[PDB]
Amino acid sequence: TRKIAIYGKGGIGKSTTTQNTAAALAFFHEKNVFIHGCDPKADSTRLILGGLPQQTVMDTLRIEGAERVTVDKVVKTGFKDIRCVESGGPEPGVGCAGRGVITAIDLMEENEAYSEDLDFLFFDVLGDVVCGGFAMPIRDGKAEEVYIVASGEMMAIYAANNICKGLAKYARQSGVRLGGIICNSRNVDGEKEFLEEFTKAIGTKMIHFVPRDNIVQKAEFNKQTVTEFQPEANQAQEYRELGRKIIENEDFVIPKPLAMDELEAMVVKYGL
Amino acid sequence: TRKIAIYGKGGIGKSTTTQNTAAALAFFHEKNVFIHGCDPKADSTRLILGGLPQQTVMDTLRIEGAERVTVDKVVKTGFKDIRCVESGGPEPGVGCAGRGVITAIDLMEENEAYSEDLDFLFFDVLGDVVCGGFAMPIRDGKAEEVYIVASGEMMAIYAANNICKGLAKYARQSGVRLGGIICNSRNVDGEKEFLEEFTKAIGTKMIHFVPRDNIVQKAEFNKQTVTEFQPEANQAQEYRELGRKIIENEDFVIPKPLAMDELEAMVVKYGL
Amino acid sequence: VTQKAREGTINPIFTCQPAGAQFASIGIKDCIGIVHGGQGCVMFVRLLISQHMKESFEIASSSVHEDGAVFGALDRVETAVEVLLTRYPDVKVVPIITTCSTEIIGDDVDGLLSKLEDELLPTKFPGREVHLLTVHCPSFVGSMITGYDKAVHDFVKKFATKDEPSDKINLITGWVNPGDVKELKHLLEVMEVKANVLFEVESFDSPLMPDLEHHSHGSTTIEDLRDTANAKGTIALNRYEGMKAADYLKKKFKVPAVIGPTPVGIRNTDAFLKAVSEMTGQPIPAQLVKERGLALDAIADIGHMFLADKRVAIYANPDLAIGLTEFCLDLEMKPKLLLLGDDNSGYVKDPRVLALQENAPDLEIVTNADFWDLESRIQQGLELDLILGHSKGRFISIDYKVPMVRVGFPTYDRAGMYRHPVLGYGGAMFLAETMANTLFADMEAKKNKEWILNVW
Amino acid sequence: PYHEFEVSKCIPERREHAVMKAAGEDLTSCLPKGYLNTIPGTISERGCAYCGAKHVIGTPMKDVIHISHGPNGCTYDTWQTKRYISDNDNFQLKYTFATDVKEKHVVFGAEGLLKKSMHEAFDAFPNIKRMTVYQTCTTALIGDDVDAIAKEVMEERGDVDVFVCNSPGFAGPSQSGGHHKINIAWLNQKVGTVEPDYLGEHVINYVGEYNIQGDQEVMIDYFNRMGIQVLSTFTGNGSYDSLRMMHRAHLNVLECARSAEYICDELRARYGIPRLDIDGFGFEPLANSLRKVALFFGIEDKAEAIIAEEYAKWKPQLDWYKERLKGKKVCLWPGGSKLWHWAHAIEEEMGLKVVSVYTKFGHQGDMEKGVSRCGEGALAIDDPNELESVEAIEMLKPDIIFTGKRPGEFVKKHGVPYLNAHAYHNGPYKGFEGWVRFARDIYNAIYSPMRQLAALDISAPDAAITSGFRTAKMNADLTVSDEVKFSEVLHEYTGKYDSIAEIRARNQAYAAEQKALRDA
Amino acid sequence: SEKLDPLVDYIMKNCLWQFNSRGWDRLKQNAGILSQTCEILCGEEPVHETAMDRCYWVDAVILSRAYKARFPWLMAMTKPEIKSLFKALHEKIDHLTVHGSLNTELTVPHY
Ligand SMILES: Nc1ncnc2c1ncn2[C@@H]1O[C@H](COP(=O)(O)OP(=O)(O)O)[C@@H](O)[C@H]1O
Ligand SMILES: Nc1ncnc2c1ncn2[C@@H]1O[C@H](COP(=O)(O)OP(=O)(O)O)[C@@H](O)[C@H]1O
Ligand code: CLF
Numbered sequence A, B: 001t002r003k004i005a006i007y008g009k010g011g012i013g014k015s016t017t018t019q020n021t022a023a024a025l026a027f028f029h030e031k032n033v034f035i036h037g038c039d040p041k042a043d044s045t046r047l048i049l050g051g052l053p054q055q056t057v058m059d060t061l062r063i064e065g066a067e068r069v070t071v072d073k074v075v076k077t078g079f080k081d082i083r084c085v086e087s088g089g090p091e092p093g094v095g096c097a098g099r100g101v102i103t104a105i106d107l108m109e110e111n112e113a114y115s116e117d118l119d120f121l122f123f124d125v126l127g128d129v130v131c132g133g134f135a136m137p138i139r140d141g142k143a144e145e146v147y148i149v150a151s152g153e154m155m156a157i158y159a160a161n162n163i164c165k166g167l168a169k170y171a172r173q174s175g176v177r178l179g180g181i182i183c184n185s186r187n188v189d190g191e192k193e194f195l196e197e198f199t200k201a202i203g204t205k206m207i208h209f210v211p212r213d214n215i216v217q218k219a220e221f222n223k224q225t226v227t228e229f230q231p232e233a234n235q236a237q238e239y240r241e242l243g244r245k246i247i248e249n250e251d252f253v254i255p256k257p258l259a260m261d262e263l264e265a266m267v268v269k270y271g272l
Numbered sequence C: 001v002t003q004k005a006r007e008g009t010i011n012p013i014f015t016c017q018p019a020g021a022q023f024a025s026i027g028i029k030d031c032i033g034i035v036h037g038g039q040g041c042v043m044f045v046r047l048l049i050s051q052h053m054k055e056s057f058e059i060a061s062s063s064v065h066e067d068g069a070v071f072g073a074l075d076r077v078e079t080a081v082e083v084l085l086t087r088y089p090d091v092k093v094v095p096i097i098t099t100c101s102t103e104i105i106g107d108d109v110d111g112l113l114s115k116l117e118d119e120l121l122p123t124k125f126p127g128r129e130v131h132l133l134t135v136h137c138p139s140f141v142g143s144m145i146t147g148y149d150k151a152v153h154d155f156v157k158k159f160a161t162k163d164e165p166s167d168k169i170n171l172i173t174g175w176v177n178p179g180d181v182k183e184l185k186h187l188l189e190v191m192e193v194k195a196n197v198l199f200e201v202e203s204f205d206s207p208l209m210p211d212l213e214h215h216s217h218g219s220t221t222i223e224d225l226r227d228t229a230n231a232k233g234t235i236a237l238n239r240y241e242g243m244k245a246a247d248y249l250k251k252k253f254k255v256p257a258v259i260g261p262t263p264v265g266i267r268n269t270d271a272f273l274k275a276v277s278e279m280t281g282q283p284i285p286a287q288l289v290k291e292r293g294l295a296l297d298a299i300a301d302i303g304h305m306f307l308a309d310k311r312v313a314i315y316a317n318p319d320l321a322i323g324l325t326e327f328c329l330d331l332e333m334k335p336k337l338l339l340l341g342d343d344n345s346g347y348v349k350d351p352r353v354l355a356l357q358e359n360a361p362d363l364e365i366v367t368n369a370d371f372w373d374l375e376s377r378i379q380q381g382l383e384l385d386l387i388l389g390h391s392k393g394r395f396i397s398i399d400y401k402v403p404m405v406r407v408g409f410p411t412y413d414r415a416g417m418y419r420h421p422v423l424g425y426g427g428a429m430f431l432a433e434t435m436a437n438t439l440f441a442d443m444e445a446k447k448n449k450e451w452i453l454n455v456w
Numbered sequence D: 001p002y003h004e005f006e007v008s009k010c011i012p013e014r015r016e017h018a019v020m021k022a023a024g025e026d027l028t029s030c031l032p033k034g035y036l037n038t039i040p041g042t043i044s045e046r047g048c049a050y051c052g053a054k055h056v057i058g059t060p061m062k063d064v065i066h067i068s069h070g071p072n073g074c075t076y077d078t079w080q081t082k083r084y085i086s087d088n089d090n091f092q093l094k095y096t097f098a099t100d101v102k103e104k105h106v107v108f109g110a111e112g113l114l115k116k117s118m119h120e121a122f123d124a125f126p127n128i129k130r131m132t133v134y135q136t137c138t139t140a141l142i143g144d145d146v147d148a149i150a151k152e153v154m155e156e157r158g159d160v161d162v163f164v165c166n167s168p169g170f171a172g173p174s175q176s177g178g179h180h181k182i183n184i185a186w187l188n189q190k191v192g193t194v195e196p197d198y199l200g201e202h203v204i205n206y207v208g209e210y211n212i213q214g215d216q217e218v219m220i221d222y223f224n225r226m227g228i229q230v231l232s233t234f235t236g237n238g239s240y241d242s243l244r245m246m247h248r249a250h251l252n253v254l255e256c257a258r259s260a261e262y263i264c265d266e267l268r269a270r271y272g273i274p275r276l277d278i279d280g281f282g283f284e285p286l287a288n289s290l291r292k293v294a295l296f297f298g299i300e301d302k303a304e305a306i307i308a309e310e311y312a313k314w315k316p317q318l319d320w321y322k323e324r325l326k327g328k329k330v331c332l333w334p335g336g337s338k339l340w341h342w343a344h345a346i347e348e349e350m351g352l353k354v355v356s357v358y359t360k361f362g363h364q365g366d367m368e369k370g371v372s373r374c375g376e377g378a379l380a381i382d383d384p385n386e387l388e389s390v391e392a393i394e395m396l397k398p399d400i401i402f403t404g405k406r407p408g409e410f411v412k413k414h415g416v417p418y419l420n421a422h423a424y425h426n427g428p429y430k431g432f433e434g435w436v437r438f439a440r441d442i443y444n445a446i447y448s449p450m451r452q453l454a455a456l457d458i459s460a461p462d463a464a465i466t467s468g469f470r471t472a473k474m475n476a477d478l479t480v481s482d483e484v485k486f487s488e489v490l491h492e493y494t495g496k497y498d499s500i501a502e503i504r505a506r507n508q509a510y511a512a513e514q515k516a517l518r519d520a
Numbered sequence E: 001s002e003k004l005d006p007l008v009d010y011i012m013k014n015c016l017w018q019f020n021s022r023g024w025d026r027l028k029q030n031a032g033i034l035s036q037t038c039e040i041l042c043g044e045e046p047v048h049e050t051a052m053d054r055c056y057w058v059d060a061v062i063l064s065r066a067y068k069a070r071f072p073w074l075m076a077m078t079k080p081e082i083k084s085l086f087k088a089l090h091e092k093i094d095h096l097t098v099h100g101s102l103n104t105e106l107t108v109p110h111y
């Protein structure tokens, strides 16, 4: 099984792209996919389950206890029998959501939730990796590959660069590798060129380009993915190509982050 | 002094909107503005300072100690003499940014960084309020008003509703209130109607609509706000109007968050 | 001054801030604190106070578990206050002490106080006098010393209220034994000076009564704390255990504050009495001259015969340890090692420490020390005749055959040390004679000129 | 029926945590709840999961650096509060280690500090090659990866071994969360990683013993005399490497099933090692336990010889105290297993009446054991608080209480003497000699002349003031008959203040002899 | 009835083998130990096919010794009534320890 963690800037489309690629992998390529949402607001599997799951691992520990969490109470099955679990966590401004992710992933390991016949295990993480508990998906025994979702916007690239800085530690400790940069288009002038240049300066590749399309919004309003919504749409084929590129990926590297002066010099060609 | 905290979905434009509105407030309305960035990646003050500060409250505590932090080593001055400080914090995947924000705001109160003559103090906070340390800006003696940045995307509205849930709790402890929803447009079909419905449903209002324009990205690539880049442009006028609408705001409420079944019912007319 | 080069701890000298706040709280009458955090954070501290005093004190917990840490635990504090107030109807003061865990996750216990006072107290305890306060004690800052200092400041800030002026002074004792408070109160009573004593911990020693049960408690009242604002002045004996509260009183109510000296030994007791005399206008009377003379006669019997040139290592609470070093120098002993067991930055600026560096030639001061500082220096060849310190360094004394006099907190390996003073003239006589008797017993155990104890 | 306390009416959740044994009821009628969350503000007796893992089970290991990843306070608070001794010169009592986490390490990460602290500890104690890192509250919330650091330190040194215990204080309702965590961690990381050098003909693992005042040494002496090899002891007087060899024992001899049943059940499930629950306390329970162990190996006659010899030596002395203790009431208030280890044996062999039992952390299994072994009318409480204990004393009027130090100091101020159920008083209390030592402690506490003096009010007009002296024997002989008082076979305890010195100096002789023969 | 109460009472006051951590383990403990006790009292020599069978047997040997010492009426009954009595004893111990047990931890799937 290929265990992958998805990182990137906040609101860049980590969850949408993760769910859509999982649906494409299960539908067009007949793959066994598991999604572990690592965000306390628990919105990482709504499109696959067709509605927000109402049992997170943390809600189950709070109600029943750690010893009563079962891989049947918290793991749901959605589109194309994709298995979905949500870490859960607190409401904004209280608690430790980092510790909840640590405990949720620990509990799924102890209960052997991720099967050995899975083909893909996606850890969909939040956008603000503010503590060590949000790096739990890239520890030893967890995700071996990381894809960063970015865009041509400068703050998305800066966030992607920041994640690479923090990812050095886990590349040394657990051997996790950066598989490439997924570019979710934000309709920025010169976006393709900026992504190619940035991915080159840090030593990776832009694995796929995901167009900005409103069919994604329409499907999201309908509680499903694009693949479930409209398999023959162009956007569904874009997720089918991203999934294939992930399947046939063999470029896994340790990113070399850019000092911010290099990134400042790089963005000049695009502010014209 | 009007102390304000900005919340919203990750990457919705909180930092960009805060810096641009602060520039418009200082330039078009001649207001004394302070920005305290509460994001460990410390990118909340780039457009005002013309580049990332290299001294953060947390970097100084790490090198010299808490007792050797001064309001001169960490507080910088940028466009139209807007005073800026960054909380700082760890690189992604280590430590505790939440504690760093608690300590940074504590230190800036101890050292009287916020001068009596300030008209506005903006606490720019990250998008994933994962702990009680990122709600430190809305405790007693801190921001009395909160503006949530959202858009027509259903995840942004869901994040706004989630933030309102946490903000309802503190409204009964601290007297923090919701001043409104700022809509940073993502070009969603039905975006205006969705935002009007959602703000009415929770008891607040859309204070202003900020269009999606590429001049914002161009100015950002040039390390400045639109007001600094092009004062007479249309986007600069939008920030000036938004600044004017904040100045004249008197509608501060305790939000009524929607149960997920209500929000699911509401979004049915938008996916057509 | 040497700062410890290792970053980890081998055998810590002090515990964490919440323990200090808890110890300050048990000195107040009708006060039960709630430690907001894990159960160990309160249970171990109750055991530690029990080791020192051989008595049980009531401190409560909010009992934070995994769901409390992940989801927020302010509901635990709200429940704790309600349960504690319903089940203990005599409680008037409830301090809420935070720990490392709830300081990390940012539980807003200050804002919760406002809600409790507006909703829970008026509703479910109407007409009951209940005062709630917060003491923020992140254990990754400071130590139990800074926790105590902060809690005294917090108690004074909660209660002190301007009113009609009083002839009393404020005596903030610092972290001292019940025997120390008795000595200080005796000195004030001879001088005819009324004081608000922070804290009245003589009732820590409770009697075993025939019929009426009588538990250990503190005796400082809310009225004492309220009246701190109306005093003629504040004398804080310990700069690290009470200068914050005294500075607050000066800044807020213009109550003049005299900081130190810790009245350890003859000379520092004189300086303390002179400060009291200046503050109050009261002369030092002839009875104190006589009690001072009695202590000096005892010291003269043993001084240049047995105490001169004895090599001493000292650790204690910082103020007591520094004062003990000064007393040992006055007694002609040779202090070799002083251990200041936490990261306070004021030690190197302390005028008492600067004077020690100037005129104590063979003395090494280690700041942020642990017990491995003392032990590894002995293993490398430091020769000592005596140790002054508390009981957690007892195995250094046992294993390296250096006798130890039990001072400070906690002293659990000897009986009744909390009942003897180390302050004042009585404490000076007790200290000097205990050092001599510890040395005498050691000479007899090692047969080291033990025949000499006949015609001294 | 479920006992509700007057002091706990406002917290109705407390009703189902107490039962009173009634005639015509069995385990399926009523049973106090257990292993639940604590009610905040009750001033309960419960500790934290770090206590259960580190303080209770981990530290007893004698050749290990026990370093807590966290601030100094957790490490200080558990230092010099326990009485598990070892034949490694009590290294585990004298040296304690912390990383001393500060605020800069909280904000920026404390993994570099942990690695540096580990190297410092190994450097300062070059004869120690084993280490356990314990999580605290602080470093468990921030997400420090201790396992990665342990791997790095091991490969950098090349001759050390590190065990990782991820048991922060908040991770569980009591010490029980810690018990479970450290058992499963040791099993998964460490068991099977070392092979025994020599395997005798009868090999046991002694599980669930923590050598309080030499309790394990007492039991090792008995096993030696039956010719039984104790491969490892979990964990009192235990060495790190022997505990890595647990998978090679013929039999698991489980003493404390509250703290170590997890590793026993899993060794049984994985390696097929049978689990044999035993009692170490009492004459008859200890005799039966020795009989079972010897019977498993077919060496029963050796157990019988030990039992006859020990009965002849100690039964007359135990009966001296038993005659004087008949009918005295006791409250049995430990944390865990000692309530059901003692409840039946104390009534039978010392004549005491057990009027109440409680557990601080025990699950429903401990309570089903304790209710079974207690008489009708005994009060069984789970997760007691201080006010409940006061109410119980005023209702039951015990003559002595077995509890902790601080709870003991509390009940002292209500007139009652106490013996330390946790650390003992003049222990060890295990063995045949140990039971006699326990009986003498009970008798000394109850019949103290000072206790009657303290009950006397000298300001009362017609106060029974006397002069001279009284002895405990004078007080206790007022309760016995002439036949007992002038018995020529019953005599008081004839043992040294340190009963473990001679026992330890015998276990060591045996070890030397066995090594000699083996090496030949 | 008058035969079961002394036997059950002795087990619950003295023995520890019936208080295992999980119901599925308690069932095996009960069955093995009690069947072997019935065999011992019937004059039989139980046969062991596993090390756990031998562990069942040591408890069985101690318990049968206690039953012989304390309940002389057992050695007077014949094998059919001893079997029926121990069948009844097995049911009662199962009901007390597993079937009717209020210990909810017995169904926790992990150790
Ligand atoms: N390819 C896309 N085209 C259009 N909208 C998109 C696309 N990808 C994502 N979005 C929008 O982005 C919003 C937020 O993205 P989301 O996946 O929730 O962010 P994250 O998981 O990174 O926090 C969604 O509500 C969706 O409408
Ligand atoms: N009105 C807008 N039009 C176009 N791009 C925008 C607009 N507002 C924000 N952006 C883009 O949004 C990106 C992310 O916004 P940012 O302020 O960094 O988000 P946050 O602070 O909420 O994490 C920026 O790179 C910026 O160029
Ligand atoms: S420094 Fe507490 S003992 Fe600890 S693992 Fe948490 S419950 Fe247990 Fe100080 S405040 Fe307390 S004592 Fe430590 S946790 Fe921090």
Ligand code: SF4
Residues within 6 Å of the ligand: A095, A096, A097, A098, A099, A130, A131, A132, A133, B095, B096, B097, B098, B099, B130, B131, B132, B133, C104, C105, C106, D141, D142, D143
């Ligand atoms: S930053 Fe991470 S570790 Fe710190 S409180 Fe917030 S969620 Fe917890």
Ligand SMILES: [Mg+2]
Residues within 6 Å of the ligand: A014, A015, A016, A039, A043, A044, A124, A125, A126
């Ligand atoms: Mg997401």
Ligand SMILES: [Mg+2]
Residues within 6 Å of the ligand: B014, B015, B016, B039, B043, B044, B124, B125, B126
């Ligand atoms: Mg921002």
